[PDB]
Design a binder for this molecule. Structure first.
Ligand SMILES: [Ca+2]
Ligand SMILES: [Ca+2]
Ligand SMILES: [Ca+2]
Ligand SMILES: [Ca+2]
Ligand SMILES: [Cl-]
Ligand SMILES: [Cl-]
Ligand code: NA
Ligand SMILES: [Zn+2]
Ligand SMILES: [Zn+2]
Ligand SMILES: [Zn+2]
Length: 316
């Protein structure tokens, strides 16, 4: 809609307060005109038709429980935009400032969130397995990063390519969570998963095995479930990335950590310059080594640590 750019206030899914960019025209709409061609957030009102209605609020205050998932989808879409813009000079998911549209209250008891090719879609969860999924900034950014992948490398969603696809989304999901600088960690989905249970998550990048995922190529899953293990074998690459950033000794191989910003630069370059739709783990290693070489030099610590990390998780 046309209207005046305004700033509202509300509380997200975890009960934290935040200001949000809105547009005023009789009602205050979740439309943020300050980022690219706009961030728009929609109410699907428990249906499955998309996008639903552009979210309208009478008073620019979003403290109702029903408002929480809209506040977070809207705000975290903004943070994800700022991360790609400020850190990588990428304008929105497509690099051309495309509108970011999200729908919340999709369906009922729906334990999932997804990028559908055109927009973000968030279930509210069933209240046991999940609370509303837009409450997890890593989930928001993980899924928007699938759009970035589709507009770049076009990694296939099956087998080792598909596991790299998943890991890219966990890596940038986590780097956005650190960028937002409120409650970051190397777990995925900890904010929205299992409200009954403290301190768990869907998966861990620092210790994939904590949740049953492989942390070494010799443990790779080779069945056909989960599209050839895309959420499973991602642990191998997630661990390599965790090691590159933070360092550690993993199966006796020592990795010198180089920090988050350099991890992000190296993988973002690998994703946008070097990976192809069918890149496998070994080709990802080569892409990462080449990216680090381009950015830091073939004799740099950064290249040496990329190699140590991939060695540690058994990917040659
Ligand atoms: Ca209100
Ligand atoms: Ca966190
Ligand atoms: Ca997390
Ligand atoms: Ca939990
Ligand atoms: Cl470990
Ligand atoms: Cl270990
Ligand atoms: Na698991
Ligand atoms: Zn997804
Ligand atoms: Zn994913
Ligand atoms: Zn280890």
């Amino acid at each position: 809609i046309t209207g005046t750019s305004t700033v509202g206030v509300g509380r997200g899914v975890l009960g934290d307060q935040k200001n949000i960019n809105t547009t005023y025209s009789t009602y205050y709409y979740l439309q943020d005109n300050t980022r690219g061609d706009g961030i728009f957030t929609y109410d699907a009102k428990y249906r499955t038709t998309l996008p639903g209605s552009l979210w309208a609020d009478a008073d620019n205050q979003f403290f109702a429980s029903y408002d929480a998932p809209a506040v977070d989808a809207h705000y975290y879409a903004g943070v994800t935009y700022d991360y790609y813009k400020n850190v990588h000079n990428r304008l929105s998911y497509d690099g051309n400032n495309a509108a970011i549209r999200s729908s919340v209250h999709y369906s009922q008891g729906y334990n999932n969130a997804f990028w559908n090719g055109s927009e973000m879609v968030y279930g509210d969860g069933d209240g046991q397995t999940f609370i509303p999924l837009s409450g997890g900034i890593d989930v928001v950014a993980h899924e928007l990063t699938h759009a970035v992948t589709d507009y770049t490398a076009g990694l296939i969603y099956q087998n080792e390519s598909g596991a790299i696809n998943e890991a890219i989304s966990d890596i940038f999901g986590t780097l956005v969570e650190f960028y937002a600088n409120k409650n970051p960690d190397w777990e995925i989905g900890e904010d929205v998963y299992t409200p009954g249970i403290s301190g768990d998550s869907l998966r861990s990048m620092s210790d994939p095995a904590k949740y049953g995922d492989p942390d070494h190529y010799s443990k790779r899953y080779t069945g056909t479930q989960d599209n050839g293990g895309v959420h499973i074998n991602s642990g191998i690459i997630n661990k390599a990335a965790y090691l590159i950033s933070q360092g550690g000794t993993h199966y006796g191989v020592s990795v010198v950590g180089i920090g988050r910003d350099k991890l992000g630069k190296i993988f973002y370059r690998a994703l946008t310059q070097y990976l192809t739709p069918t890149s496998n783990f070994s080709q990802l290693r080569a892409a990462a080594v080449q990216s680090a070489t381009d950015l830091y030099g073939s004799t740099s610590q950064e290249v040496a640590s990329v190699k140590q990390a991939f060695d540690a998780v058994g990917v040659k």
